[PDB]
Design a binder for this molecule. Structure first.
Ligand code: AGS
Ligand code: MG
Ligand code: ZN
Ligand code: ZN
Lengths: 124, 105, 111, 396, 121
């Protein structure tokens, strides 16, 4: 029994391939092989074209009050600041825009084959 | 070497901290009424009984305590085994052992 | 620059996690308050009183270089800031960054 | 007719008339070995010529009035024929009190002021209340403020609304100028030379050389160096009171690295004590006090208060007290509070030109108001209702 | 990006994760998608750690502990990192050039995958 080889290198070498997120683009917009076994032809072709969110719907839901509580089953301003509120509403608008853009981006790609095709073609 | 228990270390810390509130270190040059503790015990001040002197004391800091050398003040990686004082170098350790370790000279 | 702690182990205490470690040189002795990761590192590599060890502070890399009562105990300061210089070839950088655990290919081909 | 404004601090008494300027006078008696039978009172310390080995007789312990005889003597000297010639029967007095002052001390204050001197009317407030009044007079648009009173014996952080003091959120840090001076004495005595009997000189040294560091560990590394690169290290010549009346710092061009000088000047070399001593205010745990520092205490006091009022408190941080005169104090407080404050809330830290006399100016301003007569408690009302109504009217 | 001052998952399962990130320019409270909680737990993110979170992907990288906690122990095997200087929320508009071969090789083999076949791959 021998001790292992301790190979020592510069700590900077281990960060050679690392790129900061602010310096690289999202490669998930070209991810075709990741959709296989997870995304179906129904989602890409029939569902998403009909039930994609719009900015208007997102804004309406965000601005509207909370929905009324679900019924139980039955067996049958001195300290107000204008600048702070303007900042907060700008932040809310940015957050909603980000939500919309990410929801559009995360369902833009359609599978090459899809779960249904693979299941149909996959014999026992 | 000898080792000082937690009570001795806490007593030394309390004594050093209390000495910082002393008015003078020497005696009266002329050489010939209450105190704060008497005032506190006369006030019969109870905790959680509304805002008062005791409840106004600042709580423990979130940031951890930073060790400094008991001899020169620069940061100290080392802790003395016998008394728990911090120190940063062999020279500083020797000075601490000769001056304030064990017996408080 | 790295911080290297080289000394002789005097006493190691671990309790259910908190722990203490006492190290000595020929000129000074010290007690350390240990963190969870260093406690795990010292548990994985069996360290007992009398062993002469060196610790890389940032990584917990503990290598036992003998026992003393055989290598003589270190003399000077226990904690030393050292300048370590590595000359790394471009091929080594490529292989290390080629894949996860890719540095193994520097020894077994398989690049 | 006239109104007397007094800030009975544990170190300096800010005493003056409402129609006149402000005077800073030490509020303690002195004894020296150069005088056999002679006790100096208040500003008589100017008469002594060898303040080395000076003995201090203080009327305050841990920031509260506990010695009544020396305080009475100091007040009699200040109100006597020599200083102000106060006509007690026709003068109103505004005198400040420590926060959370004990009931017994308040009773003794009321009794002494209304019977031994027989003042026409007394208004006992806190220095923070006067500072808040002055700040609101200066800034009429602000609805809330937070006052940091870093004084001789403590450092309180009290938030004030327009006409009310938030007693729930008062936080005290047991670090003051007294502690800093004693710690500097202990450090110098342990490291270079015994100065434990030189409280006056060490206090002047602290006022002259100490500063608050923006980068603590960079300054520590700079101080650890040897040679030209050690810009932090300076040489201070202690006053011998024979040919050097007052202490001074040697110029950098005149500094000698070896430390030996042909002139027989007693030179005290301070390198890391310049910013280690002021750091106790921001990090009490450095010396062993398990208490939060000034910025963390400010943030805690603000965050205890309701959410709606927090941004206003973050916008009106005011630094008062002697310890606030350290170089870099305002910038350090601003940086730390900015680091801890939410990004949506703006942070503004204001250091007045004279933080020592802020409370006196506030008292003068509150004296000049037309609502002043309603705040005070008269002696005629004192006879019957006084002992309760003094507690009732004063918001101590 | 910033030091973690609070990490509280909100139970309905977890509806969302509220995180508190600190920088030199202030503190920000963020509501995270519940899927990021798995990434935060895998990265072993605790209070006092300096992390960054990608808004578009939810990726979490724990890049060490804050150097303000370097003195909490006398000997830990930790990498202590300075507190970030800028704002918690950082926006950058970038232009990056890629080739068709990069997109081809990115789709030749799967990435990640918690299945046994994916891990062995
Ligand atoms: N230029 C200065 N630099 C540093 N500290 C100073 C300076 N001038 C005065 N001090 C300190 O200021 C303190 C006194 O400040 P004050 O707030 O006036 O004290 P005080 O208010 O009379 O006592 P308290 O705290 O109100 S009971 C002393 O500890 C001095 O050392
Ligand atoms: Mg005062
Ligand atoms: Zn030292
Ligand atoms: Zn010791």
């Amino acid at each position: 029994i021998t001790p292992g080889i301790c190979f020592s290198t510069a700590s900077l070498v281990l960060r050679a391939t690392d790129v900061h997120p602010l310096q690289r683009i999202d490669m998930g917009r070209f991810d075709l092989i990741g959709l296989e076994g997870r995304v179906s032809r129904y989602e890409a072709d029939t569902f998403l074209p009909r039930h994609r969110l719009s900015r208007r719907v997102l804004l309406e839901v965000a601005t509207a009050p909370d929905p009324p509580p679900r019924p139980k089953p039955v067996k049958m301003s001195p300290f107000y600041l204008d600048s702070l509120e303007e900042k907060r509403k700008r932040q809310r608008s940015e957050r909603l825009e980000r939500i919309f853009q990410l929801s559009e981006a995360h369902g833009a790609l359609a599978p090459v084959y899809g779960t249904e095709v693979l299941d149909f073609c996959t014999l026992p | 070497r000898r080792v000082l228990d937690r009570a001795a270390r806490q007593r030394r810390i309390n004594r050093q901290l209390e000495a910082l509130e002393n008015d003078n270190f020497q005696d009266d040059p002329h050489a010939g009424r209450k105190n704060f503790q008497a005032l506190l015990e006369e006030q019969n001040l109870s905790v959680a009984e509304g805002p008062n002197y005791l409840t106004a004391c600042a709580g423990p800091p979130s940031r951890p305590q930073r060790p400094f050398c008991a001899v020169c003040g620069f940061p100290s990686p080392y802790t003395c085994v016998s008394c728990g004082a911090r120190y940063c170098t062999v020279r500083c350790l020797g000075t601490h052992q000769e001056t304030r370790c064990l017996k408080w000279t | 620059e790295t911080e290297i702690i080289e000394g002789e182990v005097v006493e190691i205490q671990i309790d259910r996690k908190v722990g203490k470690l006492t190290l000595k040189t020929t000129e000074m002795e010290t007690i350390y308050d240990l963190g969870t990761k260093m406690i795990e590192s010292l548990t994985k590599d069996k360290v007992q009183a009398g062993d002469v060890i060196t610790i890389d502070k940032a990584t917990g890399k503990i290598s036992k270089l003998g026992r003393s009562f055989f290598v003589q105990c270190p003399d000077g300061e226990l904690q030393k800031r050292k300048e370590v210089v590595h000359t790394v070839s471009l091929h080594e950088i490529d292989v290390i960054n080629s894949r996860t655990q890719g540095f193994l290919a520097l020894f077994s081909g398989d690049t | 007719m006239t109104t007397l404004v007094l800030d009975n601090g544990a170190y300096n008494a800010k005493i003056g008339y409402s129609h006149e300027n402000v005077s800073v006078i030490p509020n303690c008696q002195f004894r020296s070995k150069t005088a056999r039978l002679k006790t100096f009172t208040a500003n008589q310390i100017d008469e002594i010529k060898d303040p080395s080995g000076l003995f201090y007789i203080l009327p305050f312990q841990k920031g509260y009035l506990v010695n009544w005889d020396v305080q009475r003597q100091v007040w009699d000297y200040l109100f006597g024929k020599e200083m102000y010639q106060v006509d007690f029967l026709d003068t109103n007095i505004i005198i400040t009190e420590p926060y959370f002052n004990f009931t017994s001390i308040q009773e003794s204050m009321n009794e002494i002021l209304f019977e031994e001197y027989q003042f026409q009317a007394v208004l006992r407030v806190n220095a923070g209340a006067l500072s808040a009044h002055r700040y609101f007079r200066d800034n009429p648009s602000e609805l809330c403020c937070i006052i940091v009173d870093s004084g001789y014996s403590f450092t309180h952080i009290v938030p004030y609304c327009r006409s009310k003091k938030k007693k729930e959120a008062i936080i005290r840090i047991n670090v003051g100028g007294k502690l800093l001076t004693n710690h500097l004495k202990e450090i110098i005595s342990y490291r270079q030379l015994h100065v434990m009997d030189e409280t006056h000189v060490i206090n002047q040294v602290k006022e002259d050389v100490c500063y608050v560091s923006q980068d603590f560990y960079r300054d520590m590394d700079i101080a650890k160096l040897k040679g030209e690169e050690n810009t932090v290290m300076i040489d201070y010549v202690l006053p011998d009171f024979s040919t050097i009346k007052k202490g001074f710092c040697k110029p950098r061009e005149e500094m000698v690295l070896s430390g030996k000088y042909k002139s027989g000047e007693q030179i005290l070399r301070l390198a890391n004590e310049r910013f280690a001593v002021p750091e106790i205010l921001f990090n009490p745990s450095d010396i062993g006090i398990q208490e939060m520092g000034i910025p963390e205490a400010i943030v805690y006091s603000i965050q205890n208060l309701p959410e709606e009022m927090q941004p206003h408190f973050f916008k009106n941080i005011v630094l008062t007290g002697g310890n606030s005169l350290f170089p870099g104090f305002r910038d350090r407080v601003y940086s730390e509070v900015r680091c801890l404050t939410p990004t949506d809330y703006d942070v503004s830290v204001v250091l007045p030109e004279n933080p020592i006399t802020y409370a006196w100016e506030g008292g003068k301003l509150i004296s000049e108001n037309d609502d002043f007569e309603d705040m005070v408690v008269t002696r005629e009302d004192y006879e019957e209702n006084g002992h309760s109504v003094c507690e009732e009217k004063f918001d101590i | 990006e910033g030091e973690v001052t609070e990490l509280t998952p909100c139970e309905t399962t977890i509806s969302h994760v509220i995180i508190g990130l600190k920088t030199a320019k202030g503190t920000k409270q963020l509501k995270l998608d519940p899927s990021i909680f798995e990434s935060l737990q895998k990265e072993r993110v605790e209070a006092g750690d300096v992390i960054y979170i990608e808004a578009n992907s939810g990726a979490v990288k724990r890049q060490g502990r804050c150097d303000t906690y370097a003195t909490e122990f006398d000997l830990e095997a930790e990498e202590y990192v300075p507190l970030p200087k800028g704002d918690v929320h950082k926006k950058k508009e970038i232009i990056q050039d890629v080739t068709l071969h990069d997109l081809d090789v990115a789709n030749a083999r799967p990435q990640g995958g918690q299945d046994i076949l994916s891990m062995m791959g």
